[PDB]
Each structure stands twice: as structure tokens, then as C-alpha cells.
């Protein structure tokens, strides 16, 4: 057992009835005195290091060639002047095991934290030394964290794509299904998580070229996609991850759900394909009134109306579908379906729940399309247009496939530096740069939507960490007040930066003129409701920072009207799995699952306390499972009212609560305006 691992395991050993949290710090020192410095490759000067990394195909020549060597050296010096120290052993371990650049033999460390941050900053700035230094100060203060793809791969020649969330629309044809399989394989090859909408696909027992009972339904397509994702597994590094979304009014919805049951046969169950269910308000109304619902055959609806079932508003179309004899449908019990969803989420955490009307009643780009499905993490909610992939030697009709750009603000570090505006604007600029530098040659609709929509996702993390280190309970009304104010400022500065980029470049996102930004509707609740903190403690937390008022929001609305907005979507709160370790932050805006988490690496045990955990804030670091899920829903809705896309919202349940409690949480989330529900993790 290594010395740093012993020093880390000494945390659980209680002295005077208290955990030895400070010992973790010592572990970090050991982890750097015994391992990191010994296995870190050192060079006589930075010029030699850069030459070795470029020549050995570690870095890219293009992004480094935009700067003189003096500017690169100045950026590296700015990164190293902070003298950044990892506060916990797990932060440094996760960085140097997951993100630090290693030799081809994987035994030496080529990149420190400062080196990786400097390289990512130089990639972000695209030739501006001052902008690169600003990015270096942003990331070394740990105010902003690029996502795992961006942080890991920026500036590296041997790399995947910087985007890892992809949403694909699948049209109801064999050509479109095969193209969707191909694109899923290509994007999993790039290292991205792929979500596919299967609602347009006709159900099982439908007609193919006017022969009856011929379609295999969406379950056969799910089997094909599951095989494709198993095959494309990042060159045998990570398990291929894919998601399939189906509307709850699709007839296959039960069989869809049956793919996640343990009792399902081998020809029914898909193991590497996550599933999500899109639930329109009509289904919730039918379940609430206990009226029996109807699941429709999509192809009959398409034949009758010329549009797909998921392309029209089910609230106004459901009665017409039911009363139409030419539309084929099957009787179901919506309450039984809700109970089945709750039971499946209890067993396996699936499916993801998308409340379609909750997403689309605040969607700014409904003119382009309504949000029909979400991503693999159930937080990307954007307009998508299906593509018509025709036969060979025939021109395809390329639509819009969602691929947003991830990046997370560290709420604790951002707010302690009183730099919400600067961090949000710099993160928006970096996300815009990464979106502009993304070029996928095997996903035509993804590339077209990236060029047109210019959608980015700016998330936040360390919400619970910040609240606990400031003596605020996550379920307290003060925490929701802080979340409201902080995320309203984040939205304000994100919109301001998007409008500034649109003014500078002279271009907005495609079909912006029809958006609620152009019409000013988006700013309605912002020009009438003041989002300043209602509690003195939160106001003192925001001291030293200008909180945008209704007049500031009116000025921003006028600015957007005059200049437009560059990004169709700006904010989405991703789970932030492993980057939260490196940043010493709690994951996403979720409450912490455990105060101290026990992990097993190799044959060794390691202990990670939550950041800033001590005896004084032990009670404020309440575990997520012990919390009331209604108050967690309230906080997530408070944040969601300022996020244009969704939030990865995992439910944290105890083994005691039943499926009725899960359904109640889901229905309260639907009532409170929650757009997506990610997971049902049972303790």
C-alpha cells in the first residue's frame, strides 16, 4: 500500500470522535512527493517540452502555431503563477489518472494541471495571448471547467471530438434507420454519447409497402442500435453508451419499457442502450382524470395527416386521433403506465422522463421545432428536424441533429471571486470556439445543426458544496433564493455574451427571427419579476457583484432585439461526472449522495470527503437520499426557470419508499415545471 493511500484511509480513523479530514491534504502532498513528481517528465525548458509533444504526435501544430513561443511561455507562466494545489487526494488522482497527458507506454506523466490548463486556454483563445491568459486565470482559479471531452482532448492530436452529447432524429424508413445506426457508430467512435429519437418510427405490426403486420417496431431498431453501440466502444476503452427516446403515446411504449425489465428475454432486452420516455401533458391529464388513454400507431397518423405523431401537439391532436377511424390505436391505462414507469425506475433507474410541455412552454425555438427528446444525460433540450436519408445516388434532405457544447461553472469558485459575469462570458466564448472548431464529416445533420444553431451548454456545479460551506441547507428556501438569483445572473450574462457575439460577428443563429428572443417574449418574466435575493444572507453572499434588475433586463432585451443572439441555446446543466473531482466540487447542481465516498481502485481503497466537509458543516452536507425529494424538485425547478435547456435531475430514493412515492415525485416535478428527470438511484 502506497503512503498517500494510507494517509487517505487515515481519514476514516476517528480522532477525538472526529474524522481526520486534514489528513487528506497530507495525502495529496505524498501523492505528489512520492508518485506524481517521480513519474512526471521534465524538460530543460518549455520550448523542448512543446517540441517533444508536437513531434511525438501528442499535440496539434495548428493551435500552437497561432502564437509566438513568447506568448505560449507567458500563458504557461500565468498558469504556474497561481501555484495551484489540489486540496484533496482524489482531485489530483482523478486528474492524473483521467486527464493528464501520458506517454504512449502510459508510465510517465507529460502534462501537469497547469500544462493542461495552459494548452486548453491556448486552444480556446485561437491566437489571442491576452484571451489565453484570461482563460488560464479562469481555469486555474477553477471558476470554469470545460467538459471532459474538451478538457481532455483540447490541443491533442490523438483525440476524440470535443462534443460528446449527440441527439439524432430517426425517420420512419429502412434507409433512415441504417443511416442512424451508421451515425451512432461514427459518433461513438468519436467518443460521444448518442441519443436517438424513435417516436417517428412506426410501431410493431404496421404496414411496409401495404403489406400488413410487417414492422418489427422500435424494439428491433433498439436491438440494432444496442449492437451498434456495443461494437463502437471507443476502440475498446469505454462501454458504448447510447440512449433511445420514445413518446409515451407511441404504441411500442410498453415493449420499449419491456426492454429494461429483468424478466425480459435475450431477444427483447437491450443492455447498453439507455431508454427515455417523452410524456406530453395530455398523458398526465389522462392519468390524473383516470380516463383510459390510447397509444397510437405512428404510420397511420402519418398517412392520415402527412405529419409524424411526435411532430404535432398531442394536446390538440389526441381527440382527433382517437375520433379518427383511419388512425389505429390501442387502449391503455395511463395510471398503470405511470406505475410501470415508477417500477422500472425503481428496478433499474430507467426510463428517463421528459415532460414535453414543460420543455416546450418555455422553449425559445418552437418555430424551428418543438423539443421532442433529450440526450443520454437528459439535460439537452433543443429543437431538432428529422432528416430524409434517401436511397443511394439520391440527394438526402439533411435536417438538424442536436449536438451542444458542454462546460460547467464552479459556483463556489465563481461566487467567492465575485466574477459571475466574467466567468459566464469567458465560458460562453470558449464554448462558441469549441462549437465552431467542431467538424463531423460522418454526421451530416449534426454538422448542419452545429453550424446553424450554434448551440452551447453552459452548466454549473458545486451548488451543494457552495451552500454547505456557507451554512445553507440544500432544501432551505434560502438555497432556492440563492439558486434563483445566481442562475438568473448566469442567464443574463449568457444572453448578453450571445448578443455581443452576434453583434461582433454580425450573424445570429439560423431562424433566430422566429425565436422568442427576437420577439422579446423570452424576457417577459425578466422585465416584470425581480430576481434579487429575498433573504439578507443571500444578498450578503452576492455582495460585491451587480445583480441585474428589471431595468437591466429591459436593456438586455432591447440589445437582443437590435443585435440578435448568436447561440440558439446557451445553458444546460450536465451531470459533470469526473470533472467535479478535479475541480474539488460536488457533481452538478445535485445534492451530494454521500458525505465521504469509498472507492476501490485496483486492489486499494480510497476515501473522498465532499469538498470543504468538516465538523462545522457536516450537518449542512446532508446526503441526497436523506433529503425530501419535493424540496430537491423545488430547487431544480427554481434553477430550471433560468436555464433554456434542461438539467440532469437524478432522483435519490430510499429502499423504503414505494412506486407511489416515485410517481408522486415525478408528478410534482411535472407540476413544478421540471423538464427532465434523469435517474432514480435507490440507496
Amino acid at each position: 500500500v502506497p503512503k498517500w493511500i494510507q494517509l487517505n484511509n487515515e481519514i476514516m480513523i476517528q480522532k477525538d470522535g472526529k474524522f481526520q479530514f486534514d489528513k487528506d491534504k497530507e495525502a495529496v502532498h505524498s501523492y505528489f512527493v512520492d508518485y506524481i513528481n517521480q513519474n512526471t517528465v521534465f524538460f530543460h525548458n518549455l520550448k523542448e517540452k512543446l517540441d517533444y509533444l508536437v513531434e511525438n504526435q501528442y499535440y496539434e501544430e495548428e493551435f500552437l502555431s497561432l502564437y509566438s513561443f513568447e506568448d505560449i511561455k507567458e500563458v504557461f507562466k500565468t498558469a504556474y503563477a497561481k501555484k495551484f494545489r489540489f486540496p484533496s487526494f482524489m482531485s489530483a488522482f482523478k486528474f492524473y489518472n483521467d486527464y493528464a497527458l501520458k506517454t504512449n507506454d502510459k508510465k510517465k506523466i507529460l502534462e501537469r494541471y497547469e500544462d493542461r490548463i495552459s494548452i486548453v486556454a491556448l486552444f480556446f483563445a485561437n491566437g489571442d495571448t491576452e484571451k489565453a491568459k484570461e482563460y488560464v486565470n479562469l481555469m486555474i482559479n477553477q471558476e470554469y471547467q470545460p467538459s471532459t471531452p474538451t478538457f481532455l482532448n483540447a490541443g491533442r492530436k490523438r483525440r476524440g471530438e470535443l462534443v460528446s452529447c449527440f441527439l439524432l432524429e430517426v425517420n420512419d424508413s429502412l434507409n433512415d434507420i441504417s443511416r442512424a445506426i451508421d451515425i451512432s457508430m461514427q459518433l461513438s467512435k468519436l467518443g460521444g454519447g448518442v441519443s436517438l429519437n424513435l417516436s417517428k418510427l412506426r410501431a410493431k405490426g404496421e404496414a411496409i409497402k401495404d403489406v400488413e403486420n410487417a414492422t418489427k417496431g422500435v424494439v428491433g431498431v433498439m436491438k440494432l442500435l444496442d449492437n451498434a453501440f456495443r461494437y463502437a466502444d471507443q476502440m475498446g476503452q469505454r462501454q458504448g453508451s447510447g440512449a433511445a427516446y420514445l413518446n409515451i403515446f407511441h404504441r411500442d411504449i410498453n415493449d420499449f419499457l419491456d426492454t429494461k425489465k429483468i424478466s425480459a428475454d435475450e431477444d427483447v432486452r437491450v443492455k447498453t442502450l439507455s431508454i427515455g420516455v417523452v410524456i406530453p401533458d395530455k398523458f398526465v391529464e389522462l392519468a390524473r382524470e383516470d380516463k383510459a388513454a390510447y397509444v397510437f400507431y405512428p404510420h397511420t397518423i402519418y398517412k392520415e395527416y402527412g405529419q409524424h405523431m411526435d411532430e404535432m401537439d398531442m394536446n390538440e391532436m389526441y381527440d382527433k386521433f382517437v375520433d379518427n377511424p383511419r388512425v389505429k390505436k390501442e387502449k391503455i391505462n395511463p395510471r398503470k403506465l405511470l406505475e410501470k414507469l415508477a417500477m422500472l425506475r425503481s428496478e433499474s433507474g430507467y426510463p428517463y422522463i421528459m415532460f414535453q410541455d414543460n420543455v416546450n412552454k418555455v422553449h425559445a425555438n418552437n418555430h424551428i421545432s418543438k423539443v421532442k427528446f433529450s440526450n443520454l444525460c437528459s439535460e439537452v433540450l433543443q429543437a431538432s428536424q428529422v432528416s430524409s436519408y434517401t436511397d443511394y445516388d439520391e440527394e438526402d434532405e439533411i435536417g438538424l441533429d442536436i449536438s451542444c457544447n458542454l462546460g460547467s461553472l464552479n459556483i463556489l469558485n465563481v461566487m467567492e471571486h465575485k466574477s459571475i459575469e466574467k466567468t459566464v462570458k469567458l465560458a460562453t466564448d470558449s464554448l462558441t470556439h469549441v462549437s465552431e472548431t467542431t467538424d463531423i464529416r460522418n454526421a451530416p445533420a449534426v454538422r448542419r445543426a452545429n453550424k446553424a444553431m450554434k448551440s452551447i451548454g453552459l452548466g454549473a456545479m458545486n451548488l451543494h458544496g457552495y451552500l454547505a460551506q456557507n451554512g445553507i441547507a440544500y432544501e432551505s428556501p434560502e438555497a432556492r433564493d440563492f439558486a434563483n438569483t445566481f442562475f438568473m445572473m448566469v442567464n443574463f450574462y449568457s444572453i448578453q455574451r450571445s448578443a455581443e457575439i452576434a453583434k461582433e460577428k454580425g450573424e445570429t443563429f439560423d431562424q433566430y427571427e422566429g425565436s422568442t428572443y427576437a420577439t422579446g417574449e423570452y424576457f417577459d418574466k425578466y422585465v416584470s419579476t425581480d430576481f434579487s435575493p429575498k433573504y439578507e444572507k443571500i444578498a450578503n453572499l452576492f455582495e460585491g457583484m451587480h445583480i441585474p434588475t428589471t431595468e437591466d433586463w429591459k436593456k438586455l432585451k432591447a440589445f437582443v432585439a437590435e443585435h440578435g443572439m448568436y447561440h440558439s441555446y446557451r445553458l444546460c446543466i450536465a451531470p459533470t461526472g469526473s470533472i467535479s473531482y478535479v475541480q474539488s466540487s460536488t457533481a452538478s447542481v445535485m445534492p451530494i449522495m454521500e458525505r465521504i465516498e469509498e472507492r476501490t481502485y485496483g486492489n486499494s481503497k480510497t476515501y473522498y470527503p465532499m469538498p470543504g466537509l468538516a465538523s462545522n458543516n457536516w450537518f449542512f452536507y446532508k446526503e441526497a437520499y436523506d433529503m425530501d425529494m419535493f424540496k430537491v424538485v423545488d430547487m431544480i425547478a427554481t434553477i430550471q426557470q433560468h436555464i433554456d435547456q434542461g438539467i440532469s435531475f437524478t432522483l435519490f430514493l430510499k429502499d423504503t419508499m414505494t412506486t407511489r412515492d416515485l410517481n408522486r415525485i415525478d408528478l410534482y416535478a411535472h407540476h413544478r415545471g421540471i423538464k427532465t428527470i434523469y435517474y432514480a438511484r435507490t440507496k
Partner: protein, 289 residues
Amino acid sequence: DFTQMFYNQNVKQFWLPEEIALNGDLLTWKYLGKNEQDTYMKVLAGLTLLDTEQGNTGMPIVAEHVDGHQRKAVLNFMAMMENAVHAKSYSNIFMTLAPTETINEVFEWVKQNKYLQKKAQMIVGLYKAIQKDDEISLFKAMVASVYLESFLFYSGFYYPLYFYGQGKLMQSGEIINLILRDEAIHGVYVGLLAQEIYNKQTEEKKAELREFAIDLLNQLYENELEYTEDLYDQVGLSHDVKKFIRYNANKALMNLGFDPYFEEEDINPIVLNGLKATVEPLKDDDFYF
């Protein structure tokens, strides 16, 4: 007062030989002398024969004649263990360690071995002599079964335990310990049923039943001595094994509620070292907040 706790103990002890990987014994087996391997194969073959008849005949026939669904369930479970688990485990051991010809030869050897045939003849004869509604014939068969469970297996068990205790053939030894753990509870249970029948008798009848039990034990014992010498003389252990079988004969008598018959002796210390979520429907009030 006891069947339910035996039921629970038997079902919680359930196992399959496939749970134990046997390829780890390959080297310690290879290293044994030809004499040692021969004795080992033959010992396990003798055990296989006993379990074959205990599973095919002994336990099912006793189950048939014992009253009460729970008592029958325990006896049926024990029968299954004998032939579906125990007897089969020996083939798992054989198939790992030995080539097919050696396996074929040892099964031919059980058919022609006079001591093994005699002990099977005697035990199975008593099983097949049980008469419906005749508690005395049933008692006699239960005594025979206890003697098989708690005495006769032990000339065989000695050798795997002897190796296990030296850190040799430990995977095979793990299987054997599981078998032994089962037989110990089987012998106690059948012993308690036998005592039930014995306790119903007059003092005169009891005296005759003790005579039967002791005469049978002595007859089986004398045969087991010859069997033991035949197997163990080539490995130098016959005297040691004899002490072990006498020790276990006393345990069999005790399982039958009788006093020990043989004097206590020191057993080889090596052998001693060898030992879904809850579902509620949705109410109309859960849709309003």
C-alpha cells in the same frame, strides 16, 4: 419440535460442486505417489456407491413411510442432496484429476469389491425390507441409514480430510467438507426419527432393538476393518483410519440415543485440522399539489 429447524438448516446449506473450481488441485494430485492416488480414487468411489444408494433408495423409501408433509419435505431434500449433489460431486473430482480409463477402472472395481458389495447388500436389504405401517422394520432401516451417514462414510472421508489438513487437494477437500457437513445433520435427523419409534416400545422390545443395533454395528464394523486394510495398507494408514471409524461409530450410536461402544483414542491431528420494489396504486390525490 425439530423438523422446521432441520428444514431451514438443510435448505440454507444447499450447494453445487460447480461452485468450487477444481483445477487448483491439479498439481498436488500430480505429486502424489501411485499408491496414494489409487487409494484416493477407490475411497471416493466407495463413497459414490454409498451416496448412490442413499439417494436412489434409502432416503426416498424412508420418506415414503414417515408421516407428515414437513418431515417428508426434509427427507426428500436430503435424498436429492445424496444423488443430485453428493454422488455427482465425486464425478466432478474424478473428471478433473483422472483420465477416463482410470475412472472406468475404478467404477469396475466397486462392482467386484467384496466389502463394498457386502455393505451395500446389508444396508439396501434393510431399506427394502421396510413394510408399510410396520414401525419396527422402519426403525431397523433408520438404524442402517444412521450407520451409513455417521459411521460407514468415514473410512472414505478420512483420506480427503488427511490431505486437506496438510494443505493438499484443498479444492476436492472443500467439496468433501461440504458433503460431511450435510451427512452430519442427516445422521442426527434420521437418528431422532429412529428414537421416536424406539421410545414407543416396551422395555422388552427396546432390549431387542438395542441387540439389533449393536449386532448390526459389529457386523458392519468387522467388514469395514477388512475394507480399511484393503485400501489403506498400501499408504500405511490402516491403524489410524480404524481409530477414526471407531470414533464415528460412537457418534452414530449417540445419534440413536445409545451409549458409546468403543473406547476413546487419539485421532491423527492432521485429520482434525482437516475439519423489485413495493408497489402502491396511484390515488387521485397524488395528481394534485
